Amino acid sequence: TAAIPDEIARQIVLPEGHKDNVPLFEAYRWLRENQPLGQARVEGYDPLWLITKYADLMEVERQPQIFAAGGGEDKGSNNPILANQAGDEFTRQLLGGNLRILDALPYLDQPEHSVVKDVAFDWFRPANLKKWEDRIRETARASIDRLLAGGPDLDAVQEFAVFFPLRVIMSLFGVPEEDEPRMMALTQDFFGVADPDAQRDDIEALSPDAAAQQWAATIADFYAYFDVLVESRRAEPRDDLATLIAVAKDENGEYFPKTFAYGWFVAIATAGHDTTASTLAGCLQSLAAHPEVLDRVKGDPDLIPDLVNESLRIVSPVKHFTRVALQDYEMRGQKIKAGDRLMLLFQSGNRDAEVFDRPDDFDIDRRPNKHIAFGYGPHMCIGQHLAKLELKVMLQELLPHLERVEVSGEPKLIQTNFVGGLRKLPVHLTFS
Ligand code: HEM
Numbered sequence: 001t002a003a004i005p006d007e008i009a010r011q012i013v014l015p016e017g018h019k020d021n022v023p024l025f026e027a028y029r030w031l032r033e034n035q036p037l038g039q040a041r042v043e044g045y046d047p048l049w050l051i052t053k054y055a056d057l058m059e060v061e062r063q064p065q066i067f068a069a070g071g072g073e074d075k076g077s078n079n080p081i082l083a084n085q086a087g088d089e090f091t092r093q094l095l096g097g098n099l100r101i102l103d104a105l106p107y108l109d110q111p112e113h114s115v116v117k118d119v120a121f122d123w124f125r126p127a128n129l130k131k132w133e134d135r136i137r138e139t140a141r142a143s144i145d146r147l148l149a150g151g152p153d154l155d156a157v158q159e160f161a162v163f164f165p166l167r168v169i170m171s172l173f174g175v176p177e178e179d180e181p182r183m184m185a186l187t188q189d190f191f192g193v194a195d196p197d198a199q200r201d202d203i204e205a206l207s208p209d210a211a212a213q214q215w216a217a218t219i220a221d222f223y224a225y226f227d228v229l230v231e232s233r234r235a236e237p238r239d240d241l242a243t244l245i246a247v248a249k250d251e252n253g254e255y256f257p258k259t260f261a262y263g264w265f266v267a268i269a270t271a272g273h274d275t276t277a278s279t280l281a282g283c284l285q286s287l288a289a290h291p292e293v294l295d296r297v298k299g300d301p302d303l304i305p306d307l308v309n310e311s312l313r314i315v316s317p318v319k320h321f322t323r324v325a326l327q328d329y330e331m332r333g334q335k336i337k338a339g340d341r342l343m344l345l346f347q348s349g350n351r352d353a354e355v356f357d358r359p360d361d362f363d364i365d366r367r368p369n370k371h372i373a374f375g376y377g378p379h380m381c382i383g384q385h386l387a388k389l390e391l392k393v394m395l396q397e398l399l400p401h402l403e404r405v406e407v408s409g410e411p412k413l414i415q416t417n418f419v420g421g422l423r424k425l426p427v428h429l430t431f432s
């Protein structure tokens with residue numbers, strides 16, 4: 001019934017606690033074993049129930065009428081992405097009393113969430129992504145040719161893994177190649193709001209609300225760019241994802257307000273490539289640690305989807321979203337009160353020993369691989385089938401060219417409690 005111990009709560013809640021995966025995953029493990037559903041009360045944050053168990057993540061996510069993303073009828077009364085209190089106070093000054101800074105899926109509750117998701121639902125289904133496989137494969141091949149020409153010594157992240165998923169999503173989206181560097185810079189600003197190596201020059205870096213200022217500044221740069229793209233596709237439609245979203249109309253034949261298109265476009269321009277790059281880099285890191293796995297998948301390319309699934313489980317680069325209890329609710333002997341916020345810890349769910357035998361082991365032979373790296377419930381990752389296709393296609397093209405991966409310098413993680421993974425993986429490759 002007590003609060004979570006401060007040292008454990010701080011390790012998970014504070015962005016600084018994610019700088020090193022070792023103490024972070026030991027804090028998740030301490031909770032799952034000792035206090036699987038407790039309230040973290042960290043100075044400068046709202047109290048948060050830390051949802052550490054696989055079964056609890058599904059129980060919460062499958063009941064959106066109880067556990068809201070955006071606050072329910074009081075729209076924008078909950079921030080789905082954990083800011084500190086000072087940050088949420090900054091946002092309420094910016095927006096005038098609420099926290100809905102984007103009109104994007106994570107901020108929405110049903111039935112609004114369903115109406116908006118219906119715009120892109122079919123586009124993201126596996127059968128509808130098949131039309132892109134050959135173009136993704138040509139992109140993967142172009143990226144691997146540059147890797148082979150560049151020699152065996154590189155940062156597998158900033159000199160390889162980042163470019164492929166960015167080129168794929170910008171090509172599908174319909175953004176020209178020359179705009180990719182600025183999209184990459186803004187994605188770094190967006191997911192780097194609390195990382196001292198990713199600070200924007202235009203906001204206060206050390207203010208209590210610094211991360212919320214960076215988030216808003218980054219969004220404003222996206223809105224400027226996307227407003228031009230929305231008016232462009234409304235005036236002259238193309239066969240691209242920018243058009244599908246730009247021209248989308250409601251049941252009354254009115255365009256959705258432009259901010260809905262901007263919200264899609266922000267999610268696509270950031271989430272649409274960064275986590276794909278992280279998972280690919282974490283895959284290479286695991287192949288360095290488990291060379292027998294690389295030998296096996298080179299011997300049987302049909303194992304590549306299993307390798308992708310186990311990489312998603314181990315890397316789990318999307319660490320949380322938040323929810324708010326719309327009513328009192330009992331779970332695992334604890335009384336969650338109406339108004340209480342919850343932090344869904346997907347990386348912890350993915351190490352739950354009740355679900356996964358030897359959960360810290362890299363084992364591609366888990367079948368089925370029950371991972372929750374894409375979440376659950378109506379907010380389950382809409383991009384997951386695009387991500388899995390890109391990772392499958394890259395590893396089908398790449399792994400024949402790799403005899404060995406060696407990590408030849410210190411890996412670096414993005415310092416974030418939100419969307420993380422490797423920003424640096426110095427390697428020495430042996431080409432086949
Ligand atoms: C390895 C790659 C990816 C991983 C691990 C990942 C993971 C996640 C997770 C855990 C969520 C939250 C689910 C929940 O709240 O229960 C999510 C949401 C989302 N993801 Fe992904 N994601 C990935 C790739 C993508 C891609 C490629 C796109 C777009 C092209 C994308 C777009 C989204 C969107 C728009 C949401 C919000 C959905 C909603 O709230 O309804 N993601 N992702």
Ligand SMILES: OCc1ccccc1
Pocket residue numbers: 106267270271275318381419
């Ligand atoms: O895939 C995670 C994500 C989705 C939308 C916006 C930010 C991050």
Ligand SMILES: OCc1ccccc1
Pocket residue numbers: 121122124125378379380381382383384385
């Ligand atoms: O809810 C996950 C999902 C993914 C792709 C298309 C539709 C829905």
